[model samples]
Target: SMSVKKPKRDDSKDLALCSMILTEMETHEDAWPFLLPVNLKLVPGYKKVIKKPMDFSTIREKLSSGQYPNLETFALDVRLVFDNCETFNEDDSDIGRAGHNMRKYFEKKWTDTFK
Candidate 1:
């Protein structure tokens, strides 16, 4: 198995940028709704409706623990959170709107920093 041609780039900047982005998203007003896992007791259908659950705290844990292979995976997880939110809640609802808002904020920051 002579698979030694994979190239790598320095990703320290990404970690810093991701941490900064997390801080910004966490502080935003809309973040409250996404800060924690949805309580099954409150929404009995959440588990059934959304097969994959995601949240800010979970993202932070991944970020802090260095589990992500790169920023793309991290962004993927972040998007998953918002996508799941929209799946279970109406776009006009409070929590649904929060997901959209935070997702918008995250995308803007990601572009501003990475792109």
Candidate 2:
């Protein structure tokens, strides 16, 4: 008989980073820019499609007006999408491209804010 292996859990640092993102979502609206406005695409066979450039601000405004449930759910969904991106291959990963662009955007904004 063959032995089966259990799936490993996510990294603690990843969990922490995700938690921090969630906390920011709950607390600050300005954090929307950091959280959204980018694209995320995965490769084929990866049923997980994290399409981004998300208008989190628009989503939040809708939720605030009682048009949606809550920001927590939205944040969780985003985290899940990101977490599942392991299915993507670097050469064809749109999510990877989006991540790079987002990081650049944040770095620029952060520098500008401090200046």
Q: How far is each candidate from the true structure, as Cα RMSD in Å? A: 2.2, 12.7
Q: Estimate each model's TM-score.
A: 0.88, 0.28
lDDT of 1 by residue, 1-115 (tens): 3977667766768888898998998899879888898887898898788888999899999889989889999999999999998888899899889988888898999998877
Residues 1-115, candidate 2, lDDT per residue (tens digit)? 2687688654434334434444444454334323543333433443345443344444445444555344345444444433333324262456555544444443454344333
Which pairs of residues clash in candidate 1, taking residues 3 or more apart in a chain or in different chains?
none
Q: lDDT of each prediction vs. the true structure?
A: 0.88, 0.43
Q: How many times do residue backbones clash in model 2?
A: 2
Error of 2 at 79 (Å): 1.9
